[PDB]
Ligand binder design. Structure first.
Ligand code: NA
Length: 302
């Protein structure tokens, strides 16, 4: 029996590593009664439709791919919101009360939410350091494709664009775009470090991907397999924090081998200044999600 697991990312990514672990674990628990076919990006239309349609059972879904159906995921693109420290942040994402707050929004899009997975700190690149909001003024800056994510950088005085990834390398190179944001492994993979001079680490937000399932397939499962599914996802939460820290560190060393790229970690004072200036994205987020958005912000604040 076969479970089909689609990824938004290619081989080598955090999603792929996670999925490999999910495969090995589920096959060993199930005694071969369940086999898992992993479909990385390229090997195949939209993953969220395939999951709703039942064409695949399981998929990763990031806030960008969900923003028009599940706007609450915008929470994950808000700067300085989720706890910085890894353990509180892990606790939150794992909290049944936090997951459950999202479940209805996902159901509303015909999806079963199973959990959240970290892909790493978002990292900024440009051809100058980004130490104060003032450094963003007038900059065309490429953001996640979420209204909330756009507003975050608009708050610093940037002009946010959502240029298609395949075009970003050459637009960066030509100066059509001044910088972008992504986790370090994605930057290395796309080669943006070749056409940028400064990597700024503000630790403002993390890449958080959703694991979702077909709504009826999930519900039409033996309480045993649903435990194999749910307990494994639960286990892999902790290992995911470790996989991404390591993959991102490796990719950062690879980036530095290229040369011509400077690394800047913002001081607490500099971060505090961006926090102050980030607040308006929270307002736009609330306008878009109402009372549910408010409570999510409340749960993640304390
Ligand atoms: Na450079």
């Amino acid at each position: 029996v076969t479970w089909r697991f689609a990824l938004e990312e290619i081989e080598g990514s955090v999603q792929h590593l996670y999925a490999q672990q999910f495969r090995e674990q589920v096959e060993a628990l199930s005694g071969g009664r369940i086999e898992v076919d992993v479909f990385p990006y390229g090997s195949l239309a939209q993953l969220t439709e395939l999951t709703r349609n039942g064409s695949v059972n399981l998929a990763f879904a990031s806030p960008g791919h969900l923003a028009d159906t599940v706007p609450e995921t915008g929470l994950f693109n808000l700067h300085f919101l989720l706890p910085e420290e890894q353990e509180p942040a892990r606790r939150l994402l794992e909290a049944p009360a936090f997951i459950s707050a999202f479940e209805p929004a996902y159901h509303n899009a015909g999806l079963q939410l199973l959990g959240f997975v970290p892909e790493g700190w978002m990292t900024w690149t440009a051809n100058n350091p980004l130490r104060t909001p003032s450094d963003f003024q007038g900059l065309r800056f490429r953001t996640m494709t979420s209204e909330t994510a756009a507003e975050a950088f608009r708050s610093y005085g940037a002009d946010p664009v959502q240029t298609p990834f395949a075009q970003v390398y050459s637009d960066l190179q030509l100066g059509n775009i001044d910088g972008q944001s992504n986790p370090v492994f994605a930057i290395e993979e796309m080669g943006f470090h070749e056409v940028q001079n400064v990597l700024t680490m503000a630790r403002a937000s993390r890449f958080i991907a959703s694991v979702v399932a077909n709504e009826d397939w999930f519900a039409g499962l033996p309480s045993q397999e649903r435990k194999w599914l749910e307990e494994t996802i639960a286990q892999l939460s902790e290992e995911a924090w470790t996989l991404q820290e390591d993959l991102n560190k490796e990719r950062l060393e690879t980036i530095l081998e290229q040369g011509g790229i400077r690394v800047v970690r913002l001081t607490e004072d500099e971060r505090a200044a961006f926090r102050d200036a980030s607040l308006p994205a929270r307002q736009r987020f609330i306008e878009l999600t109402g009372e549910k958005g408010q409570a999510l912000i409340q749960r993640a604040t304390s």
